Predict the 3D structure of the following.
Amino acid sequence: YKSVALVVGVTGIVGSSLAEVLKLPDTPGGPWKVYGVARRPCPVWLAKKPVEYIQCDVSNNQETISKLSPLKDITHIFYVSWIGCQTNATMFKNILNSVIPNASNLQHVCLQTGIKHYFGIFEKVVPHDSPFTEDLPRLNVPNFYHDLEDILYEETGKNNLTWSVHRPALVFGFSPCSMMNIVSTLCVYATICKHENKALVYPGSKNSWNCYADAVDADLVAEHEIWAAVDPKAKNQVLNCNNGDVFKWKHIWKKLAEEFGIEMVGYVEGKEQVSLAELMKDKDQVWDEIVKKNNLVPTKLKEIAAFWFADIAFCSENLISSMNKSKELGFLGFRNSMKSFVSCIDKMRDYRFIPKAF
Amino acid sequence: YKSVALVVGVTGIVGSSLAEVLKLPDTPGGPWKVYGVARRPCPVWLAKKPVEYIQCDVSNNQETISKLSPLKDITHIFYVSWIGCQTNATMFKNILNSVIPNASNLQHVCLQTGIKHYFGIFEKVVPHDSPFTEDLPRLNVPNFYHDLEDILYEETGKNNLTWSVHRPALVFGFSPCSMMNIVSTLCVYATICKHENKALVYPGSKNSWNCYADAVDADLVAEHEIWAAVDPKAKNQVLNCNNGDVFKWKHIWKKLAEEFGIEMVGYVEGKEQVSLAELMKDKDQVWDEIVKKNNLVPTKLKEIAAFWFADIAFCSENLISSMNKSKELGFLGFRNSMKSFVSCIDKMRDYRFIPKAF
């Protein structure tokens, strides 16, 4: 092995893409050894992969020391755990305190944050307008992402390590474990509609129907993090990560209806946004019956879908981010966002989480 | 010489970029010989370049035959003349009728149209929504661009030639001859404001201030046309061409003010769009005095600026085009649109068409 990755959050959407992409033939930095850390016991999908799984609650300092301090060969840390204050800072500090003193060939720390935390719902002071670039200064408004950056900079600086900060847009992806996942949430809603013989009714705002939006494929995020981990010209940079294009929810919606073979009802002029979370609140038993009727992987509705997260997406606009910095540094990776969305639907079907198309 | 280009419209914004780019070291298809056709006598900027200049009114059939039929060595036609009905069709037909029977090693015809003709101001039948892709079918609405495509397909088909249709977004560029040029128009307005000690007052709509827009650098259009002219995998395709990013007029405006060292007045809530053409209607003499006072290249206001064209830009929105098709075919060329806009300002200054910054 040439390089040794510690993927913190391996069962998450991006973490699961890193485990796969790190193991492909001709991956930069390779051949890679991969340690994958997550709180749950190793999922069956990941047990069959060449990943060394470490079950660890990284919010527990002792346990993090016990399980990560023996891993002497780590060269690259990829901190990609979903970010839901002091707990996120503590988790990241735990990782760095447990590995930095023990891994004598440690080179680089990759920190994943996001363009916006929950679409900016928590952000008095006038915010920066879009298209979002990485050179925009920090505004005097508290931010959990800025607290993690500060720990990265301090710990990498003192220890002669390189750093990256990756700011993914809304992620399109799927793996057998990760929730707070937009495509899964929308596929679940489509599946319920189809089961109940109802149309795929758009519950969102006018503006989110018609505005330009962007996103990022989980695999592209993995490629971008690996690139910044191995390209010396890319190191010690804050870097956005999106698919390189724009889309509209209205087009995703039509595609979604088409893929499920159901009628669409788009935005209806004058009709106000309604909560998808509200529409779905009494559907937990319906979901149980769908799983049974279609022999799906048993999931609970609250585990596979986050309707509240779709609701925020559908009252958001003006959130486009730029890839000019990455491109000007030589990263020309992209995805067709419409093709990426469909590929996630296909993947959920292939893994039996939602019914087949026919 | 390996390849022999006939650049129809060499004094235009894209044509002048093709003449330059076709002559760079290590240009695909090279070394290129370049014939440049335009109606005016050879400009002094272009006389010093290794371009064989052909003065020709291509709307005159006889003259086109007289001047183009002796050019036996042409391999590639680049039809990039500005498109202002029967006249545009006739001009293109003239070119093909004059060259196809005479140029026995002719390979390829590149046809440049646009994403929209004059931002769609001439387009009953419900138009296609954006982001614009090349697979969207033709709608039963007359279109001068569709008439030129039809001639391309018919003439290339019958003669065993390959074709390309390039659909540039709004072009950012500058050369010493071309009008209907957005950056020039805005630099001229900025120059007048500065001369008169007034602020750079935005005269446009609210929506065009705040909406996402896109554009294309003239040099990137040249690179894209050359790529499709030489890459066999790219041939016989309709292909959009933009810089790969998005911007907003509000940000361009601030940049424009900054570059001229003048105060900005942005969009003012409640104030309706006013015509820039109207604001400038009695400025022809003012422009003469600015040229004199700053020793600029002598231009007439009506030749260097098209304020009406800026006015259309500033009541337009929802015109974003996709580069996914080109990227998926392996064309990864891009520009930072904000940097491209500034480079055009720099170029106009360098060539002495507008005053220096200080």
About this structure: Chain A is about 40% helix and 15% strand. The first strand of chain A starts at residue 3 and ends at 8. Residues 144-158 of chain A form the longest helix (15 residues).
